[PDB]
Design a binder for this molecule. Structure first.
Ligand SMILES: Nc1nc2c(ncn2[C@@H]2O[C@H](COP(=O)(O)OP(=O)(O)OP(=O)(O)O)[C@@H](O)[C@H]2O)c(=O)[nH]1
Ligand code: NI
Length: 462
């Protein structure tokens, strides 16, 4: 992706969003009980921890666009993926406005907590004002759809979250780029059934893990990905995608039966306008980031990418023998025999993608189940029931999180949350964690879940 121009809102007539942008994160009662070193991300240009220009650090993610037009490899990759999806029988007919807004069994209601985007956030109009789950009324949504139209700018703001110290000095905060509610509804009307089938079918047919429940999905992965694993970390995947990947996605959507009306919506994600503070700017390439409404298309594009890199790097590679699941930039894949990840990463570089095998430096200790990572979690076979796989969030992450809170009233819920994640690391790790919570009088007053009970509830899921 690449920014084309930047203009003040005075010029473009776009509505600004306000200040103040101080963090809501504060040191919790555990900040000094547990160890970590992340702090709240930089939120504003005059933050005292900044060592660089903020605005320019924020937009440096846009590394440019390499290709605009699918070559033969990308073309072949798109076809393979699209053929594979045919077995799912995705319903390409429009989804009703009611279902797009309010949900079906395989699609969640538009979240009534997050902002409604442009112009609603700037006008003070909330989702709550438009949408009622008790009524499932769409007449008010239609009213605002007619009022503001489609294809609105992406109201863009800095994510309030913990970051490494290096990310803070270097101003590398992350942005949330919210589409207008109007455009989410219309996108969801166009591709809602596809979203339903992807949520219902996490796995290797869809090539997708979006919406999965790691508690149970982890046990399936070793079966769905036999042979030898490969996996990378992208740097700045979303923003590094050039328009070519959007063209390839269109090829996939066309191959599986989409009308040109539906398909033309992709260009509105490839070429977008953003309003950040009081400037508006045009981005070409790059998946808009921070939702959710974008996860499936990032994941689909990743299935295309991996395929294209595979056939362009290695001759006579058989794509039928590839197994992969993707969740946004995050990918876990396997092939009948080892793959030179370094050579993949150099092909990636040709397409403007930055890739690094997840490890130290540089490449692949095979990457097998003991050190594999997906959605941040490792893979730990149960001690008693090895066919059951625990998803393990590293305690280091849990340690970072507990030390901060956005609301002091939430100590109980925040701690229970972390315990639900921690016990998967084993009895001994869990007990050490609980005992540290309990080294402090507030900790002792909390309701903390019992290990073997947590485990028995987990066994019931199988
Ligand atoms: N901007 C943004 N990115 C998100 C968000 N949620 C998930 N992501 C993903 O996070 C990536 C940015 O992650 P960072 O922690 O800044 O860095 P990175 O891309 O992992 O690469 P490194 O710099 O090597 O650490 C994007 O490319 C997205 O795929 C979000 O809310 N906003
Ligand atoms: Ni533009």
């Amino acid at each position: 992706g690449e920014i084309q121009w930047v203009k003040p809102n005075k010029e473009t007539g776009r509505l600004s969003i306000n200040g103040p942008t101080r963090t809501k994160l504060e040191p919790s009662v555990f900040h000094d009980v547990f160890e970590g070193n992340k702090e709240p991300a930089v939120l504003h240009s005059k933050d005292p921890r900044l060592e660089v220009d903020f605005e320019q650090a924020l937009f440096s993610k846009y590394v440019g666009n390499t290709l605009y037009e699918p070559d033969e490899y990308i073309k072949e990759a798109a076809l393979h993926y699209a053929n594979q999806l045919k077995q799912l029988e995705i319903n390409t007919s429009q989804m009703s406005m009611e279902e797009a807004c309010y949900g079906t069994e395989n699609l969640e209601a538009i979240d009534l907590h997050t902002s409604a985007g442009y112009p609603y956030s700037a006008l003070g109009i909330k989702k709550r004002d438009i949408l009622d789950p008790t009524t499932r009324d769409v007449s008010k949504m239609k009213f605002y759809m007619d009022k503001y139209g489609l294809d609105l700018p992406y109201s863009t703001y800095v994510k309030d979250e913990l970051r490494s110290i290096d990310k803070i000095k270097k101003g590398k905060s992350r942005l949330i780029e919210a589409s207008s509610l109007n455009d989410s509804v219309y996108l969801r009307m166009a591709f809602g059934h596809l979203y339903e089938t992807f949520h219902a079918n996490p796995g290797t047919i869809t090539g997708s893990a979006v919406g999965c429940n790691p508690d149970t999905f982890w046990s399936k992965l070793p079966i769905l990905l036999p042979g030898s694993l490969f996996a990378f970390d992208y740097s700045g995947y979303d923003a590094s995608l050039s328009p070519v990947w959007f063209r390839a996605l269109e090829l996939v959507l066309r191959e599986i039966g989409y009308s040109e009306g539906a398909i033309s919506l992709i260009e509105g994600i490839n070429h977008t306008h953003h309003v950040y503070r009081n400037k508006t700017y045009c981005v070409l390439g790059g998946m808009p980031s921070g939702c959710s409404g974008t996860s499936i298309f990032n994941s689909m594009i990743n299935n295309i990418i991996i395929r294209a890199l595979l056939i362009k790097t290695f001759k006579g590679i058989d794509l039928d023998e590839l197994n992969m699941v993707a969740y946004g930039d995050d990918v876990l894949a396997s092939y009948p025999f080892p793959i030179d990840c370094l050579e993949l990463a150099k092909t990636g570089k040709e397409y403007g993608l930055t890739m690094t095998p997840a490890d130290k430096s540089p490449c692949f200790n095979e990457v097998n189940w003991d050190n594999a990572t997906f959605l941040k979690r490792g893979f730990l076979p149960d001690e008693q029931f090895p066919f059951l796989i625990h998803p393990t969030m590293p305690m280091r992450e849990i340690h970072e999180s507990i030390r901060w809170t956005k609301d002091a009233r939430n100590t109980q819920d925040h701690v229970r949350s972390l315990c639900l994640l921690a016990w998967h690391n084993g009895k001994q790790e869990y007990e050490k964690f609980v005992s540290t919570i309990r080294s402090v009088p507030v900790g002792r007053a909390l309701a903390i879940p019992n290990y073997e009970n947590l485990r028995r509830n987990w066994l019931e899921l199988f």
